[PDB]
Amino acid sequence: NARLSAFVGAIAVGDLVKSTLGPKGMDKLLQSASSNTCMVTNDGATILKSIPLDNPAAKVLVNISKVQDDEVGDGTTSVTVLSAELLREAEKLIDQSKIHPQTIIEGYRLASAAALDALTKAAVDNSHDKTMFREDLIHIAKTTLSSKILSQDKDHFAELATNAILRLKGSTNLEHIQIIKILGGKLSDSFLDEGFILAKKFGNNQPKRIENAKILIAFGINTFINRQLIYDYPEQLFTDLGINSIEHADFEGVERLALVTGECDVIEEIMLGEQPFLKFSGCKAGEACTIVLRGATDQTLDEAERSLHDALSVLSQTTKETRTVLGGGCAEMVMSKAVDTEAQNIDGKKSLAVEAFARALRQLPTILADNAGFDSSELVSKLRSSIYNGISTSGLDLNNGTIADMRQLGIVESYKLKRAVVSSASEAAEVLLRVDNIIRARPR
Amino acid sequence: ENARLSAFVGAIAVGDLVKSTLGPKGMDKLLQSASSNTCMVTNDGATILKSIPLDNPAAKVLVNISKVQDDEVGDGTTSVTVLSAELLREAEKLIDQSKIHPQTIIEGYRLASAAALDALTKAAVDNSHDKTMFREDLIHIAKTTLSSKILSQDKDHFAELATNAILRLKGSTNLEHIQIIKILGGKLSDSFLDEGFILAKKFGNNQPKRIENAKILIANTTLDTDKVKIFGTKFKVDSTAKLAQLEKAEREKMKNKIAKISKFGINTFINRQLIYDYPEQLFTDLGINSIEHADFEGVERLALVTGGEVVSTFDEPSKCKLGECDVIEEIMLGEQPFLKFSGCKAGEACTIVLRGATDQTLDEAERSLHDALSVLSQTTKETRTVLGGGCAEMVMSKAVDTEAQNIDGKKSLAVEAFARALRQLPTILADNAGFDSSELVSKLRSSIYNGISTSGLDLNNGTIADMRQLGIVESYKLKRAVVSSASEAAEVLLRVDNIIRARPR
Amino acid sequence: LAENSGLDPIGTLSTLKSKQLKEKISNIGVDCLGYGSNDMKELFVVDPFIGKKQQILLATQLCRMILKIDNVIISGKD
Amino acid sequence: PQEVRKANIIAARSVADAIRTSLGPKGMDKMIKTSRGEIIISNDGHTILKQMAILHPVARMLVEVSAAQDSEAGDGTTSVVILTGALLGAAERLLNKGIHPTIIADSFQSAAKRSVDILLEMCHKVSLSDREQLVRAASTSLSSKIVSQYSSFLAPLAVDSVLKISDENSKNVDLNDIRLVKKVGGTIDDTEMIDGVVLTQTAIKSAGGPTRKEKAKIGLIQFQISPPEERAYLLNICKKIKKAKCNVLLIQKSILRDAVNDLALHFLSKLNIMVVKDIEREEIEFLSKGLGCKPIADIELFTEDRLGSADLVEEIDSDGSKIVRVTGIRNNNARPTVSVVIRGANNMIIDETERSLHDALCVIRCLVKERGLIAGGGAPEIEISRRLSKEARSMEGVQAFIWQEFASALEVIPTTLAENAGLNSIKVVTELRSKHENGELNTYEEHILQPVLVSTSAITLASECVKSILRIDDIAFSR
Amino acid sequence: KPQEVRKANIIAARSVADAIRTSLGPKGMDKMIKTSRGEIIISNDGHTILKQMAILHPVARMLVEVSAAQDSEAGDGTTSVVILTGALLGAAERLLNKGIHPTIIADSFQSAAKRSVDILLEMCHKVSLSDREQLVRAASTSLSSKIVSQYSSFLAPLAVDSVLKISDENSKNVDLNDIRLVKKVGGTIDDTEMIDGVVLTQTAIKSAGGPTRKEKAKIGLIQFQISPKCNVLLIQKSILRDAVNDLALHFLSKLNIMVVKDIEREEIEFLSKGLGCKPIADIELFTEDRLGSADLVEEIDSDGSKIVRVTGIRNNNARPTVSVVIRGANNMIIDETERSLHDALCVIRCLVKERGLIAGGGAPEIEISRRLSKEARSMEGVQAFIWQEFASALEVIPTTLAENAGLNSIKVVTELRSKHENGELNDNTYEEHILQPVLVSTSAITLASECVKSILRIDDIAFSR
């Protein structure tokens, strides 16, 4: 009773996000009792967290998806679907295939090592000619911005996220890039600014432009910063003394100032979107950047926030690991060959368990071709024949409908992202395969 | 959808009845009647299927298919139904996941069945060793058939001709490789054996009597006196000579086809009808030999021994499958002109020329000879065995995987699923014998996959052992009979899209 | 333990008795971790004698106490 | 997963077919009885879909499409619903052929972009510098409204109002900056542009109020003059205002307390400080834009730099009106806006007159974003299908069949126009395609014209609507 | 669920074995069965219960065929073979829960049955047919279960001397159907005539002219009937038309040809074997070569019988077929005597086919279960565990005997394992004159291995017509 509810209950979780995977995917709609809270979004983390589930085995994949969202923030749908395909095939491995459940666990352990070795042999990085490495960051940024409304201007947004990461040259921490969202104007009007645009002004009536300012977070300082508010009388007394006081500085703003400055050459106040802004200039080796996105409505900005934050989180990891792999169904196809390669020498009970993992690797690109309007069984089988013996270059094309090279079309993936998906999804499936019974204590 | 479900789930439910009875260690089934006192128990697969009344109109088709194996051979009838039921299990997974017409998948089975028969031939062995003892038994049986027949006059000469007409073949035993020439005004004891393909009614007048390095082309056309029946067609002409000019214009277009004959690089052309002198005169300048009165039978028997094909049209020049013969000699015997072919590429055949005193002695000698050659050649495909114990079943599985390398996009799953049905035979035998089908079959496939694998299914120790050491072999005729019957059985069921419910009795 | 390790519980139990009888008297148990043969004594896996003895005493004392209750009286709720 | 989409398409097609009968002035009116007992009657598609309270989640998206239809183009709220349902009805046979909705959705976006260039080549090129076509466009659009003879003078007032805020490359201009203040009394013939600003209320009617001031400053103040000795507390309030020389006070309307005490009226009378109270909350954001001022919550936040400039602030004497006007804001940072006062004897006059001017300003604004106009009456719907007939043969694959069904769905709009007029549906459509070999856009002599943005936005919004409808493969309950 | 359908037949089969379990032994419980025709019969014999039970269950009918072969081969143990069959079915129920396929369960019974026989022959005391003192005491104890006791002293050499003439050596199976028990009204138990040549069921001609006696006669078998050098002829009894005309009796009387008519149709097949003759359908094919050989043919009537006896067939192909004559006053005498002497011939038949005898009462079943339990460690794998369950299944026969006798079930069984350790076959049934032949215990285990096999091999059943 518990195994039947855990297997079917987990597949229903993957059936909710199955349309949110891939750039050609579709949006899922949810409706509460008030009916006025309905929102259309393709975010996999939003769908899993909003929908309540009474299945205790399904709650395990929810917390695991939260860990995957903190490391990168994307690919969370592919982890849930891949974990669901392993459980869907496990039903056939238990009943009619005469396989011990722990053998299924040990089968994925030996198969996971073959999948990681396939990505290692297929990982190629270029240290020389940094211009070629910059183009790789452009192609990776196009895959992260996929499935989102930003895909329209993504061609213009490709150089926005690529040139932003190149201005860091340092720790992968994302606190250097501050996202500001202002209504009005087209999405293509967004620009990259290293001047640290601030959304708050300073003082009641004080001069806008300040030269040779000394930033002090709280002396002979031209600029004062306080976390709390400011009382009326000293705000007027600070003006006569030439000290400009800044207010409404939260914990996030203080951490961003500690990574930049103190002193600064020029503080210029500009007016954009009907609100005072502060653009600093002449800092000391500024590692921080500011991206200002211009949306049409609040709903467009709310979806663009996490879309850009998840795209820059993957590009930040590309600085430590320069190796890249070919995506678009090609990455899962290469790993499918390494599984069948190690299947030549294998035990009796582990054979069908590992071979089932090979078909599960082809289930991810199968759904990618479903939402693309094409035939999955027709297109993937034609690519599988070419990848079978040698000459593995091209991969699934979601636009024209033929077999084309991913390098020529500009579709690549990071090596660090794929090794995290194969890992977390394997550990997520092993937990649900172990549980044959669920006992809940009497609540109070 | 219920039409395929009745042809699959309805057939599998009937197929699973005799599935557990495969092998000597298989299960058993009780057959109960209405009165219940007339019942019986048996392990026969053909008895259980025919005795149980089945209202499924798709299940009645499987009964008529199983009767073909009983009339043709009569052995391994249960294995045919079990293998045919496993093909439906794989076909059901291919359809439900596709929902496309199975006729495309049927084409994948024909390409996969050809690779399965080729793998069984390379690994095939035979008991024909020490043919000296088999040749002495072949001449004695041949003389026994000659009893009550007019050929009994001389047993030694006629049995020797039939002996050299079989063991010297080294190939197909079909009678199409043995040509029979019947003439008048001769003695039966004067008959001789010739390895060449012999015609009569020599072709051409001014054509040479010897042809060196001859090529053979098969075509059907009339180059002499076209427009057979001109009666009834309205003829408007100013003069009578325009009627004969129209036939020349129609035959003028044949010059392009005559030019394609010279482009084939052949020195000899064969036609069933006659040929006018003008297109025959052009054959001399182009080095073309015109053979006439080839009929049909003699064309098919000549194309097989020479490795050629037959076609009545020309699809495109420089594309065809041609035969060849080194020397063509024109002789005359029995007051009739004869033709003699020699030097065919990989030519295997013989010709028995019998000399009778009348037409009654000629017809009775040819019919009695075919009955004697049929019994003697029956032992060629008999007693010949192959390595058994699940080996040959897995050898056919890995042979299909070789075909899975170069394959179309839609035919990739159709051919690959055929290898899965071949691996279901050791799965069923392991369950009926009381063993683990997942452990044995998986370890059996890993060893046989690449190279140096003599291993097979050992039911005594419950593990994988070498069958060559235990001496476990199965007949090769049983291998081809079951696969060919199961391939045709799957075609009959899949080619039916809709099944009308049969009339209940 | 043989059912959880992916092995035949009857086949392994009969195998352990044959190794401890015809060959020599020793301690060979079911394999909890992946290995290729029997005789876990080489792996130096030991259990306390006072710990194993405490288990069989409590299991025997519990089995006797269960047999001492032939009737279950469960009162209702007010 | 097709059972979820097919259930939503059929449910949405019944809504589109219900609104289809409301197309045109002669169309069928739909009645909706609210649970409270209120019954409304009108042909407006935006009003019907809003008060219908549709429980179907996907069908509620038609309200957002109709909202953007009136906000951008300003016309075609009924036509965009018909075109949306026409693509949904044609998509039913597409799913029966085994076509995945992705190809169906991607082909509509490519067909909508190509349909724009086809209309632009056949459209008449006009410019904003010519006022001949600008006056005739708004004058003929008012023939469906109570105003008839007075509509001739209302057309040039709306033309000169847009040409100031249109500029050249400004493209879209916010319509909320144009405020129409309706008031009982007066007539339609009396109109004043007053480009500076216009308020929604009168001035102080009590004794001592000057009601008029020259060379005064205007600013937004959220404070309120109230008692807590009381004259001393109110003296410091009026003294701090005198420090910045602010002679015009605007107090936000609140039912909590009063606006200005009667004791403070005598104090402000000597200082000649005019006060206008009962300022609506909607006008708080309006006055902060055109006047370039800032809302001031407290008395300490009040400064001179946030105060504007006003040439003359006076209360115009009129019957039952008493409208206050301000001219010469003299603000370089804040751009000017147009606020027109609407007057009339009957309350039903100034009501429909305000709505009639809305459709007149939208059509003129359509020429600002994209110049040119296309004659209505089914001409642009048929002309696109004529071009897609030969273009469908040039395509290949699954999309080739979509171009034929896309042009077939466009014929629903001209067919409905013939049905609601009583004429034979097919017979009128065949007569239009028969003359298409000679005439092209020819309705021009009938003074019936339509802007290109309405026909362009109707196709764009319907293409994205149907695109988003097929994207929902499941309906789940998430709370 | 092909296995769950078979489990439903196993439970239905064990329910039949539990019903017969109460009838085991002379102290067993009787079973009341009411036939559909209204006949009410009761008895403790398991062969008569399963015959009239009219079992409609397909698998449960196998116990009837085994009980029929149990009486045809050994002649004893038809009740115990049903209990032994149900024990293996109950032991196989726990095997199916462990994931064991019934093929290994059925194949291990073949090695277990052959091993149990070899172990039984080691403890069995080999006896020879040349000793006539062992056969008399063996058949006399089988006659103590019937009302006739003191009169059974003369019946013991009657059954012994009849088998020893036809036993010869290495005869293997000896058919008891050739030995016919003649039941005639009148006489006593002490009056018996062997007449080793043959004995008929019919009288002679009571009309005028019948010789009723002939010397040097040839007896043929004629299925024909005469109606509108052969000394003696036989006429098949036909009630439809007349058998032999009265005129034909006067015709053959002048020719000195003895006539015996009204021959029972059941004895036609019996007389065609022992006499070594062939049936004659038509007079056209009737020849002398199909006749018999008889030195003297006479009619001897003890009291009222008027029966004809023939001696000295002297046929080379035929053998000395002996028919036993039984006399008695009441009908219940010759009846109960017939079934009592029939069981005595079965016990002697067991010693002829297989030499040696063992002490009954469940004695060998205890030691065999002890030896197979210790020898189970010599095996390995799944088959090793089957030897332990097979030994426990053999203890149901001695346990049921202790239950049906009123003694404590578990107490008597423990006393068997305790006493059989030091001694061998000493527990004392030999002092009580309880002797069970080894062939009965051998056939009971052999037929049980084949019966349980035919059960588990059925994985499903369907309607077939």
Side-chain angles (χ1 to χ4, degrees), chain E residues 54-74:
Chain E
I55 295 170
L56 296 175
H57 189 278
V59 177
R61 293 182 182 175
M62 294 177 182
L63 296 175
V64 176
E65 294 177 350
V66 175
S67 296
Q70 185 65 58
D71 181 67
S72 296
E73 296 301 321

Side-chain angles (χ1 to χ4, degrees), chain D residues 193-340:
Chain D
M193 294 182 287
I194 309 302
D195 290 344
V197 68
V198 174
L199 296 175
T200 59
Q201 294 300 321
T202 60
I204 302 301
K205 294 176 179 177
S206 296
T211 63
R212 181 177 181 171
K213 181 61 175 172
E214 183 178 2
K215 294 177 179 177
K217 294 176 179 177
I218 296 171
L220 294 175
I221 295 171
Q222 294 178 336
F223 180 76
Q224 293 177 336
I225 295 171
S226 64
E229 183 178 2
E230 294 178 351
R231 295 176 63 185
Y233 176 78
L234 297 176
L235 177 63
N236 291 336
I237 295 170
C238 297
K239 183 178 179 180
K240 294 177 179 177
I241 296 170
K242 180 62 174 172
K243 292 166 62 181
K245 294 177 179 177
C246 183
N247 291 336
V248 175
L249 296 175
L250 296 175
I251 295 171
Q252 186 174 355
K253 183 178 179 180
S254 296
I255 61 172
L256 178 63
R257 299 290 182 268
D258 59 353
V260 176
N261 190 341
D262 290 344
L263 296 175
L265 295 175
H266 182 62
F267 296 159
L268 296 174
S269 178
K270 183 178 179 180
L271 296 175
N272 290 283
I273 294 171
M274 180 172 174
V275 176
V276 176
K277 63 188 183 70
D278 290 344
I279 302 301
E280 294 178 351
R281 294 182 181 175
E282 183 178 2
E283 296 301 321
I284 302 301
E285 184 178 2
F286 177 80
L287 295 175
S288 63
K289 294 177 179 177
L291 296 174
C293 55
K294 183 178 179 180
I296 297 170
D298 190 4
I299 191 65
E300 296 301 321
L301 180 62
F302 177 80
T303 58
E304 184 178 2
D305 290 344
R306 293 178 179 84
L307 295 174
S309 296
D311 290 344
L312 177 63
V313 176
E314 62 184 343
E315 183 178 2
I316 302 301
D317 186 5
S318 296
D319 186 5
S321 296
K322 294 177 179 177
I323 303 301
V324 176
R325 60 177 183 183
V326 175
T327 303
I329 60 172
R330 293 173 296 180
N331 190 340
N332 291 336
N333 290 336
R335 64 182 181 88
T337 188
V338 176
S339 296
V340 177

Side-chain angles (χ1 to χ4, degrees), chain B residues 149-151 180-184 188 352-372:
Chain B
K149 302 299 183 181
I150 61 172
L151 296 175
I180 303 301
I181 303 301
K182 294 188 295 184
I183 60 172
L184 295 174
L188 295 174
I352 295 171
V353 176
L354 296 175
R355 297 176 64 185
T358 188
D359 290 344
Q360 294 178 336
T361 58
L362 294 175
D363 290 344
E364 295 301 321
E366 183 178 2
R367 294 182 182 175
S368 63
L369 178 63
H370 297 166
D371 290 344

Side-chain angles (χ1 to χ4, degrees), chain E residues 125-401:
Chain E
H125 300 290
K126 183 178 179 180
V127 297
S128 63
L129 296 175
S130 64
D131 186 5
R132 294 182 182 175
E133 294 178 350
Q134 185 64 59
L135 296 175
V136 174
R137 292 192 297 273
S140 178
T141 59
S142 178
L143 297 175
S144 296
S145 63
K146 302 299 182 181
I147 296 171
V148 175
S149 296
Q150 294 178 336
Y151 296 140
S152 64
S153 296
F154 295 160
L155 296 175
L158 177 63
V160 174
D161 290 344
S162 63
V163 177
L164 294 175
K165 301 299 183 181
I166 62 172
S167 64
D168 291 344
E169 62 184 343
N170 290 336
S171 63
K172 294 177 179 177
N173 189 341
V174 176
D175 187 5
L176 295 176
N177 290 336
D178 291 344
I179 295 171
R180 179 60 178 166
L181 296 175
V182 176
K183 292 189 295 184
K184 300 299 183 181
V185 176
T188 187
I189 296 171
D190 291 344
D191 186 5
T192 301
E193 294 178 351
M194 177 178 71
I195 303 170
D196 59 352
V198 68
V199 175
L200 297 175
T201 59
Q202 295 300 321
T203 60
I205 302 301
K206 294 176 179 177
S207 296
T212 63
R213 181 177 181 171
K214 181 59 166 61
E215 183 178 2
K216 294 177 179 177
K218 294 177 179 177
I219 295 171
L221 275 67
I222 295 171
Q223 294 178 336
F224 179 76
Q225 295 85 0
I226 296 171
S227 64
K229 294 177 179 177
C230 298
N231 292 336
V232 176
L233 297 176
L234 297 175
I235 295 98
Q236 186 174 355
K237 183 178 179 180
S238 178
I239 61 172
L240 178 63
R241 293 173 296 180
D242 290 344
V244 176
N245 190 341
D246 290 344
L247 296 175
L249 295 174
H250 182 62
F251 295 159
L252 294 174
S253 178
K254 183 178 179 180
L255 275 66
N256 192 30
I257 295 171
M258 180 172 175
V259 176
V260 176
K261 63 188 183 70
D262 291 344
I263 302 301
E264 183 67 14
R265 295 182 181 175
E266 183 178 2
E267 296 301 321
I268 302 301
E269 183 178 2
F270 177 80
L271 295 175
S272 64
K273 294 177 179 177
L275 296 175
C277 296
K278 294 177 179 177
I280 292 100
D282 187 5
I283 305 301
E284 294 177 351
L285 59 82
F286 179 80
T287 58
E288 184 178 2
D289 291 344
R290 293 178 179 84
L291 296 174
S293 296
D295 290 344
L296 177 63
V297 175
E298 63 184 343
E299 183 178 2
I300 303 301
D301 183 5
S302 296
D303 186 5
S305 296
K306 293 177 179 177
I307 187 168
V308 176
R309 59 177 182 182
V310 176
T311 304
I313 295 171
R314 295 183 180 276
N315 190 340
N316 290 336
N317 290 283
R319 64 183 181 89
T321 298
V322 177
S323 296
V324 176
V325 176
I326 296 170
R327 292 178 64 85
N330 290 337
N331 61 345
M332 295 300 294
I333 295 171
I334 60 173
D335 289 344
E336 183 178 2
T337 301
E338 184 278 336
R339 291 192 297 273
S340 65
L341 295 175
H342 182 62
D343 291 344
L345 295 175
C346 295
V347 176
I348 297 171
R349 181 181 64 195
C350 295
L351 296 175
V352 175
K353 183 178 179 180
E354 183 178 2
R355 294 182 182 175
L357 59 82
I358 60 173
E365 296 301 321
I366 301 300
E367 183 67 15
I368 293 170
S369 178
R370 292 178 63 85
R371 294 182 181 175
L372 295 175
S373 178
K374 294 176 179 177
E375 293 177 351
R377 294 182 182 175
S378 296
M379 295 300 294
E380 184 178 2
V382 177
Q383 294 178 336
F385 178 80
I386 296 170
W387 291 95
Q388 294 178 336
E389 295 301 321
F390 178 80
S392 296
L394 296 175
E395 294 178 350
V396 64
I397 295 171
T399 300
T400 300
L401 295 174

Side-chain angles (χ1 to χ4, degrees), chain B residues 128-201:
Chain B
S128 178
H129 187 277
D130 288 343
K131 294 177 179 177
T132 59
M133 295 300 294
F134 177 80
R135 182 177 181 172
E136 294 178 351
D137 291 344
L138 188 146
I139 186 169
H140 297 165
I141 295 170
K143 294 177 179 177
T144 300
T145 301
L146 297 175
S147 178
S148 296
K149 302 299 183 181
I150 61 172
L151 296 175
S152 64
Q153 185 64 59
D154 187 4
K155 294 177 179 177
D156 181 67
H157 182 62
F158 295 160
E160 183 178 2
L161 296 175
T163 299
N164 291 336
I166 295 170
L167 296 175
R168 293 183 181 175
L169 295 175
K170 294 177 179 177
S172 178
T173 59
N174 190 341
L175 296 175
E176 294 177 350
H177 300 290
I178 295 171
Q179 185 63 59
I180 303 301
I181 303 301
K182 294 188 295 184
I183 60 172
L184 295 174
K187 294 177 179 177
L188 295 174
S189 63
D190 290 344
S191 64
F192 59 90
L193 177 63
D194 187 5
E195 294 178 351
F197 182 78
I198 294 171
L199 280 70
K201 294 184 175 74

